[PDB]
Each structure stands twice: as structure tokens, then as C-alpha cells.
Ligand binder design. Structure first.
Ligand code: ZN
Lengths: 72, 139, 143, 120, 189, 54
RNA sequence: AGCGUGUGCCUACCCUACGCCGGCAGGCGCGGGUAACCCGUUGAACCCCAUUCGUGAUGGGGAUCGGGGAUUGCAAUUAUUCCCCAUGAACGAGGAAUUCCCAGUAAGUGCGGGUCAUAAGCUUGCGUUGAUUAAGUCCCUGCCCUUUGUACACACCGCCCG
């Protein structure tokens, strides 16, 4: 079926973004868009604040791929 | 007191200058790390990550290169680094150290000393390229 | 980049039901007469960032980007951007928008059909106008 | 009636190098490269047909091959006949066709109505 | 001494099957720094058994028409897949590659015999080199077919089948074709 | 018929060049200043020195 | 990168660096080059590295059209080409059927030459990136050799019986 997603932050899904995203061992802009049902730009940009939060390790940054893992 | 050898792929000709120095290996006046296809940085660094920095600590390599493309100039640079160190060890060190370099360089990949001799075939009339032919129809 | 709350989800500008959750530069494209190129120039002339989407825009910056589409020549948008540069009747430089694009090109076409010309008649038969070959192509929708 | 925001009466005495700034680029370039020796003699023929025409009567039809003649605003109302390869077709010049060529008013072909297909 | 992409070593990789030991490359001296080698493996029959199977997977990654020359494109796809594999499993990511190539190739094919429109096949064996050739084909077209109109990139879609073939799951496209290529094979026998 | 018949401007175009031995206008080799037909070049090729090597 | 081309018997017709004016297509001067001397270190395109977009007929795709602007020409209307806005269709990987190909090959990707006042979706060459599979058979389509049947031989598209 067609994909209805959300372009900006929702009140409920922002709770989902802040606690189990550091509990995945693989965080990547095409898994966050599939799990929390968001568009790719929220997955690309909303994740890039968590690097500044110091909560999520940065594994590899590339044009077509971004790989994040949790700390420890 | 100096060496000049050439490496070679399809069209590229990297010509390596080896004199007695300290270990600054430069491609066209820039380091080996900054060479732009960095996906093949290890392809560039194979003859120094193999034989260690200490076998290169007495030389100074200024590689110039022209012709070909990016992949064909990477495979020309690393061939001329190897062929330059081997010729330096033959001309100013003994034959034994040349053998102990050459067996590791050959054991990794023979295209660090022997040129790859395959070049592009010629297009022929009747088709779009060398082997391929135009599509034909019936009746 | 927080949760928005005053989210005008559909913007009703110029009798067009445009998107409100697309980007602010590619939402204005959904009206006739604004492509992807014109909206960028009017948004840079309106001095708004283009990171934002269409729903967080305050109403001052909603009206001030429509009023630079009713008369762009006061804001140094040059003449080579406009939809009709040298008009055939008044010779005025304007960017025709969605309500009057059909209402302008109909008069451009039927102007050529009162004149009984080689192009208005070619439009009137429904055939190809710009000198294409007509033997093998254009078969779709024709009987 | 107007054309680029100026009525026909100022176009009748609009000068040669100033009317050129109202036209489109083919016609502006054509008036820049000049109207040739067999195109001055057509306008003279239309003057000679105009001032001998009766004051309530449009002038007689005049035959031409000049399909490249631009319709100047001093050429309105005349009955010219531009050829189509076979016949001279009767053209009456209206003021709304003052930037076109004369040769887009005699159609050069029979607009096609098909028959039954033979052996394809 | 020789780590693939400078990070993954080869000493703990252990091929299981004896059927594929002489054909599947690196454990010992086929250890390379990069999958790009540009060597004349197609110059003779059986010569491509002696090429590193990372280069095999890279070469079959670029199959479709818009990607047919791009090797530097596919080597970074494999490099980025070898991070996602290690994150989702936690071990060396070369042991999972030989676990996927061991598991995915069929062991009994059917050879086509009939007339124009008539099909009456018959079951034969499968050479282990054709098993290695058809392992990487099913893996790569599973990664290709399940990443086409999808938000998932090719590096995730390759990795999430390269582990699912190692685990022998039937959600992977590779094992879904092997068991049917043996199911229609046993059906004649 | 003096400002006429050879009046039309033949300053360029396909029918201002012709072969230098055929006086024919089609299939013309202007390269290197040959200005021959493609058929009359093939007759006189070995006389000009164009040898067929490969 | 590599192959190339460049002021012409009649013959008008060019490769162009550099400075200025232009969003741009172009316009002015001003030099070089009959060429390994100048364009030219031929500062090509995919490729590579960053930002944006986020599986929807979408920013993919660009057809078809309305206005302008500029070169080529004696002439551009049945659009010569080129530039700028705007419009934004089919198309979701393709049935029966069928083509080409074995290694620097297929395929991708640009570049020169011919045509050329104007001009390449063509062809002819050149590079650049660069594989999968095969190293076999006579099943199909055909070619051929040897035995051999023929009441066939303007020769199976034959000859011939109701
Ligand atoms: Zn001739």
C-alpha cells in the first residue's frame, strides 16, 4: 500500500525516537523510516542531533549510507 | 645515485624518481593519502604496507603520472613504486635484498612488476564496437 | 526542529489546493505558472530560509510571497523570468498564474483562429504544430 | 485595437527603425538585414492600389509570389494574393496579423481525410 | 598481516563443507587489502577458482544495465555491507560470507530435454563450482530485487540477506530458490 | 534574362559543389581538399597514393 | 584521456587563446596557428567526495504546447538550430516472437571524423570504467564430407494420383 509518513516531529513518536534508538545496535536512515513510520529526511536530520547528544556512536558516514550504533 | 623507472597500465605512464632520501613518497607533488580515489588508497599503499616503512626509509619518491584514467593511474603508480624500489636495491644494494623484496612483491600480485599488456580492440563496421554487431531483422 | 503545532496542512493560495507538508520551494510548484525555478527566486527575494516546510510559515511570510507573484517587477526579478515577456496586446511584462494561464493561452490560440493562420488551424484540427513528422508518431488517442 | 500597447494610428507613422523594436526576433532581424529590391516594389504596388481605390471600396486583389513578406502595419486592409504552389489565394489583411509572414495564409496542401486502407 | 579493508582479518574464517574447500578462496594467501584486483581470471577455464570470492561478489553486484561498469560503486557497497553485517551479528563478517555461499547453492539441478513446447526434464548432480557460481548469483539478485522500489538501500538489503542465507532462513530470496530448484529436481529424480 | 538566369545565390549548400571528374553533386569527399565523388575517389585512390593497409 | 581536424584552383565557407559587455544563447576588439611551434598539459563524461530529496506518477520522466531573446542565411512561416521562463502526457521493466556476443569482450560513458552557410537521436573511428557465464554439443537452425534411395534434373518451391 502507499506510504503515509510524517514530515515533522510528532508528540508520541518523539518519545519513540529518544529511548530505543540508543537501544538498537544498528541505526540507519532507512530502518528508522520503516520502524517509526517517518520520511527519510527526519531520519537523516533528526538522527544527526543524537550524535551531538553524545548518546549514539557514529560508525561510518557516506553520501548514500549512514551507520549509527549505540554506545557500550 | 638516482633511479627512474616507469609503471604502466592501459595508457597511463607513472614514472618514479628514487634518490637517497628519508621516505616522503609523493605523487605529482602531493602525499599518497590525498590521492583522490581514496577507495583504492590501499591499492596505492600496497608496496609500503607489505614491505614495511623501514625498507622505504632510505629513499624519496616523487611520482609523476599522465594518461589514462583514475583506476588506470592507480595501477600505474603502484607498479612504478615497486619497480623503482627493486631497481634501487639492484643498483645500490645487493642482489639478495632485491630477491627478498621481489619474492614478496611477486607473491602478492605479479602486476607489481610485469606490465598488463591488454589494450582496447578496434571498432569494426557492422557493429557498435569490436565484437558486437548491429541488430538484424527478417523478411 | 521540534514538534510543530500551528500546522496549516493545506494552503489555499490562488484557488489551488497546494501541499503543506512538502518543502517550501516545491510546494509553490503545484500551481500553474510556477515551476521549480521560479519559486526559488521568489523565495530568495522574500528572504526566507528554504530548509523549512510549508506548514510552519507565519502568515506575514505567507502573504509576502504571494504579493511578489502579483507584481514581481518591483522586487528586481528580471524580465527573462516572466511567463509572458512582451505581450502582443499591451506589451507588458508579467508572470501569468493559475487562474489566467488557461484564460490567456486560450486567447492566444483563438487569436490565431480568427486570423485563419497556419498554426491556429493546425491547433484546430488537433494535429502537431511545431513541424514534427506526422506519419509514424502521435498515434495514441487518435482514431 | 493595439499591438504591444500602441494603437494602429501611431503604427502608420511609426518610423522604420522604431517599429523594429516592437517585433519579434525573426522579424526584427529581417528588418535589420533589410527589405530587398523585389520587396520595396510590392509596397509601392500596394500604395498604387490604395490611392487609386475608391474611398468606400477596398482595393483590387493583387497577385504575389512573395510568401516571405512580413505584414507591416502600413499594409493593413489590402487584398493581396499569395501563391500556394498552384493558385493565387485571396488574402485580406486585418490589423491583428501584423507580425506574421504572408505565406502562412495560402495553405500549401490539401488537409488529409483518409480513405479505406488497402493492402497494408 | 593482511586485513580486508584494513580491518577484517581472515585467520578465524572456517569453511565448513569439503565440497567447496578447494574452490572458495581466501583463508591463506588470497588475503587482499581490497576486492579490486583487475586480474585476468577469465583467461582460462577453472582459473576463476583462484580469485578472492569478495571480488566474485563485487563483480556480480554490478549486473544490471545501468551499473555495468561501476566497480568502485560496488566495492563501497560491499564495504558498507561489511559494517552492517558486523553490527547485526557481532563477529567476523567473512565467516558469514562463506556460510552464505555454502548454504545457498543447490546440489541437484534438472536438465531440460524435450521438443518445441514439451518439457520432460531429468535430475542430475551439481558441480561444486557451479554451486559457487549459483550461490553468489542468487544472493546478489536477492539483494537487487528486494531493494528496487524500497526505502532500504543496497547495503542494508545485501547485508540482511547475507546473514539470512547464513542462518538458512526461508525469508531470504537465495534459500527460497535453492529449495525449489531441488524440489522440482526431486519431482523427477 | 541578364539579371536572370544564373542569378540565384549559389554561395554555399549542396548544389554549389560538384565532383571534379564526374561533375556530380552527391556523395562528395571534401576532406583534405579532394572534392571527388565517393565513387570516383575509389577509382583513382591508388593513383593519389591512398593505399588500403588495414 | 585517446584517435583526430583546422584559413580551401573554381569557392563564398575555420580551429580559435585572451580582455571587455551580457543570466544565458551570443556581441565587440584583439592575438596565434598552412600546425609535435597555436587552440592544447587537448584542465571530456560516467567515475570519486560533500548537501538536499525520501518510495508517491514525487523533485523520476521529459513528450506536447504559450510567450520572449540570439546567431546562420538572399529567404527560417509547415516551428533550421540555439538560449530563458512556463505547461508537465505516456511510461511501474514489458505477451507471442526475436537479435548480438568469449576478454580489455558485453554493457556503461563521453570525444573526434563524414555529412556541415546552419546542424547528429545516424554512421565511422577513439579512449575511459569494466564484468557474469563457456572452454562444449549436434537438440534446433544451417554448411560440409562419406556410404545410398530416387520414375528428381527451365532439380522437393520437384515429379505426380484420383
Ligand atoms: Zn564523381
Amino acid at each position: 500500500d502507499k506510504l503515509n509518513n510524517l514530515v515533522l516531529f510528532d508528540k508520541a513518536t518523539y518519545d519513540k525516537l529518544c529511548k530505543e534508538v540508543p537501544n538498537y545496535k544498528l541505526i540507519t536512515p532507512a530502518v528508522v523510516s520503516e520502524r517509526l513510520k517517518i520520511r527519510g529526511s527526519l531520519a537523516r536530520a533528526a538522527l544527526q542531533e543524537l550524535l551531538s547528544k553524545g548518546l549514539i556512536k557514529l560508525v561510518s558516514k557516506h553520501r548514500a549510507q549512514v551507520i549509527y550504533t549505540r554506545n557500550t | 645515485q638516482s633511479v627512474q623507472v616507469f609503471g604502466r597500465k592501459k595508457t597511463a605512464t607513472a614514472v618514479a624518481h628514487c634518490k637517497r632520501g628519508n621516505g616522503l613518497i609523493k605523487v605529482n607533488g602531493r602525499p599518497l593519502e590525498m590521492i583522490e580515489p581514496r577507495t583504492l588508497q590501499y591499492k596505492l599503499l600496497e608496496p609500503v604496507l607489505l614491505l614495511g616503512k623501514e625498507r622505504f626509509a632510505g629513499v624519496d619518491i616523487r611520482v609523476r603520472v599522465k594518461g589514462g584514467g583514475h583506476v588506470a593511474q592507480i595501477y600505474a603508480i603502484r607498479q612504478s613504486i615497486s619497480k623503482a624500489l627493486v631497481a634501487y636495491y639492484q643498483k645500490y644494494v645487493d642482489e639478495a635484498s632485491k630477491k627478498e623484496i621481489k619474492d614478496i612483491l611477486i607473491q602478492y600480485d605479479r602486476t607489481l612488476l610485469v606490465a598488463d599488456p591488454r589494450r582496447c580492440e578496434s571498432k569494426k563496421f557492422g557493429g557498435p564496437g569490436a565484437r558486437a554487431r548491429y541488430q538484424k531483422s527478417y523478411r | 526542529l521540534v514538534i510543530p503545532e500551528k500546522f496549516q496542512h493545506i494552503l489555499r493560495v490562488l484557488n489551488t489546493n497546494i501541499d503543506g507538508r512538502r518543502k517550501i520551494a516545491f510546494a509553490i510548484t503545484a500551481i500553474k505558472g510556477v515551476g521549480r525555478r521560479y519559486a526559488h527566486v521568489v523565495l530568495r527575494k522574500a528572504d526566507i530560509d528554504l530548509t523549512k516546510r510549508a506548514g510552519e510559515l507565519t502568515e506575514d511570510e505567507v502573504e509576502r510571497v504571494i504579493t511578489i507573484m502579483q507584481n514581481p517587477r518591483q522586487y528586481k526579478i528580471p524580465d527573462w523570468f516572466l511567463n509572458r515577456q512582451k505581450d502582443v496586446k499591451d506589451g507588458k511584462y508579467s508572470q501569468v498564474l493559475a487562474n489566467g494561464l488557461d484564460n490567456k493561452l486560450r486567447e492566444d490560440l483563438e487569436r490565431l483562429k480568427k486570423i485563419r493562420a497556419h498554426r491556429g488551424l493546425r491547433h484546430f484540427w488537433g494535429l502537431r504544430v511545431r513541424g514534427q513528422h506526422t506519419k509514424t508518431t502521435g498515434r495514441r488517442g487518435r482514431t | 485595437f493595439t499591438y504591444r500597447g500602441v494603437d494602429l494610428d501611431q503604427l502608420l507613422d511609426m518610423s522604420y527603425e522604431q517599429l523594429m523594436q516592437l517585433y519579434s526576433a525573426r522579424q526584427r532581424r529581417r528588418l535589420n538585414r533589410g527589405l530587398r529590391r523585389k520587396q520595396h516594389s510590392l509596397l509601392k504596388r500596394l500604395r498604387k492600389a490604395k490611392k487609386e481605390a475608391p474611398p468606400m471600396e477596398k482595393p483590387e486583389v493583387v497577385k504575389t509570389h512573395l510568401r516571405d513578406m512580413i505584414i507591416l502595419p502600413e499594409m493593413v486592409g489590402s487584398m493581396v494574393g499569395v501563391y500556394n504552389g498552384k493558385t493565387f489565394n485571396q488574402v485580406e489583411i486585418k490589423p491583428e496579423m501584423i507580425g506574421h509572414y504572408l505565406g502562412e495564409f495560402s495553405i500549401t496542401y490539401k488537409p488529409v481525410k483518409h480513405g479505406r486502407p488497402g493492402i497494408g | 598481516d593482511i586485513k580486508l579493508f584494513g580491518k577484517w582479518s581472515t585467520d578465524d574464517v572456517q569453511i565448513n563443507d569439503i565440497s567447496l574447500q578447494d574452490y572458495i578462496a581466501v583463508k591463506e594467501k588470497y588475503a587482499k587489502y581490497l576486492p579490486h584486483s583487475a586480474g585476468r581470471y577469465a583467461a582460462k577455464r577453472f582459473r576463476k577458482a583462484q580469485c578472492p570470492i569478495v571480488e566474485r561478489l563485487t563483480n556480480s553486484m554490478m549486473m544490471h544495465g545501468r551499473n555495468n561498469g561501476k566497480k568502485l560503486m560496488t566495492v563501497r557497497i560491499v564495504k558498507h555491507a561489511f559494517e552492517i553485517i558486523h553490527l547485526l551479528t557481532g563477529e567476523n563478517p567473512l565467516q558469514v560470507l562463506v556460510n552464505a555461499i555454502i548454504n545457498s547453492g543447490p546440489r541437484e539441478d534438472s536438465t531440460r530435454i524435450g521438443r518445441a513446447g514439451t518439457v520432460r526434464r531429468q535430475a542430475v548432480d551439481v558441480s561444486p563450482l557451479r554451486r559457487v557460481n549459483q550461490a553468489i548469483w542468487l544472493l546478489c539478485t536477492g539483494a537487487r530485487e528486494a531493494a528496487f522500489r524500497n526505502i532500504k538501500t543496497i547495503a542494508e538489503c545485501l547485508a540482511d540477506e547475507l546473514i539470512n542465507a547464513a542462518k538458512g532462513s526461508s525469508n531470504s530470496y537465495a534459500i527460497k530458490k535453492k529449495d525449489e530448484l531441488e524440489r522440482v529436481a526431486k519431482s523427477n529424480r | 534574362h541578364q539579371q536572370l538566369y544564373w542569378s540565384h545565390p549559389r554561395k554555399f549548400g549542396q548544389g554549389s559543389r560538384s565532383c571534379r571528374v564526374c561533375s556530380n553533386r552527391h556523395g562528395l569527399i571534401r576532406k583534405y581538399g579532394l572534392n571527388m565523388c565517393r565513387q570516383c575517389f575509389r577509382q583513382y585512390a591508388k593513383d593519389i597514393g591512398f593505399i588500403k593497409l588495414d
